[PDB]
């Protein structure tokens, strides 16, 4: 009977950054996905791998909710098989991804006049991320062929650039809160089911 705490996922007052995206494992509950698509609040809603109609009828073993924040223009990279600063160093979606990605604009809650620079994003890395690989390393990356002994210099930068979220910015540079639902189906009895299955 106990439903899945999706309210503890979208409505959360504090979201984490994308380089340190948060994950809340969802299991042993009842899915009510009708709440999701019966709403005009979500800007980008794209279900990958699942049916556009069997949403409330499916039954998966476990469900993973990956929630983070990126700006208006970096949501196109939250998709299977994409190339981008977020889709290479922050959040890598596999090509066989099976789940629904949810995104909406939050330019009034995560932004403020004068500046709200609490959110960060990984700008540099010597290798593209693997799927589901969370990277929170804090070592000074080296860009050029000149070694770096940690000094913040010409080609040695702190690998986390802050997000400048002000209300008077372009549409592409506004905070968009993203929730990625990953449907895990293993060789085991399901735990997250719908109401009409």
């Amino acid at each position: 009977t106990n439903l899945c705490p999706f309210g503890e996922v979208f409505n959360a007052t504090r979201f984490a950054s994308v380089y340190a995206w948060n994950r809340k494992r969802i299991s042993n509950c009842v899915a009510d996905y009708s709440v999701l698509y019966n709403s005009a609040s979500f800007s980008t809603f794209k279900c990958y791998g699942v049916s556009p109609t069997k949403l409330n009828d499916l039954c998966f073993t476990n469900v993973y909710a990956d929630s983070f924040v990126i700006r208006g223009d970096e949501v196109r990279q939250i998709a299977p098989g994409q190339t981008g600063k977020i889709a290479d160093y922050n959040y890598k979606l596999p090509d066989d991804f099976t789940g629904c990605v949810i995104a909406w604009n939050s330019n009034n809650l995560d932004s403020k006049v004068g500046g709200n620079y609490n959110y960060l994003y990984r700008l540099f890395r010597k290798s593209n991320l693997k799927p589901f690989e969370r990277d929170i390393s804090t070592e000074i990356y080296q860009a050029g062929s000149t070694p770096c002994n940690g000094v913040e210099g010409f080609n040695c930068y702190f690998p986390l650039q802050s997000y400048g979220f002000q209300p008077t910015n372009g549409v592409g540079y506004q905070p968009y809160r993203v929730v990625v639902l990953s449907f895990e189906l293993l060789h085991a009895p399901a735990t997250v089911c719908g109401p009409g299955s």
Partner: antibody
Amino acid sequence: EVQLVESGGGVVQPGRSLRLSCAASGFTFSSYAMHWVRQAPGKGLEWVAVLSYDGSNKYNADSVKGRFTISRDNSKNTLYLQMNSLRVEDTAMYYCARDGVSVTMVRGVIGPLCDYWGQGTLVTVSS
Amino acid sequence: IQMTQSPSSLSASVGDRVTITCQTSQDISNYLNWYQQKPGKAPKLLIYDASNLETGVPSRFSGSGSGTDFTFTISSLQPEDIATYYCQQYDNLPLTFGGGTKVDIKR
């Protein structure tokens, strides 16, 4: 809306000094970085130097390191480019543009970079 | 320091589909920019970081950002569109531009 009006370029023999100006208007100037980029007559664009949001990060390009220094007055919403030891080659039209994507420069990534709004053809004429 | 390549000297009739490919040099560049420069006027930022054009452009331009090779697609060519098109990289601070592409509508 926003206009990066420039004035201060003229004709001056090689070896002298002449600074340029980049007067901002509209948007908050103490929040965005500022570039300087020139284009020779008939040639293409060529980067010169840049300034952070007054964070003491110049990072000038080559052939001008020590000859050009970038100055900004965020309380006056203006931007300067002091020029000394005129290489006669430096005759070009200089453009100043904003920036909001740089890494050790302007705090936070806001908007794109190099929204040009440039003018002020600066000729480094001979004797 | 890169030396960005670009095929210049284009020619296409009114209302066509052209493309310009800016392949980068060493240290593969991420998120180039696309500008247009009509004669006698300062350049203008057309597209954002390898995609996602700004507000004001007539939405006839596009691009794709994939590592070392980039493209710049122009659909539905216009008589008031003859200019010079550059591509600029920003991952190392010595920013370098392209070669510029002169456009002339076939009449």
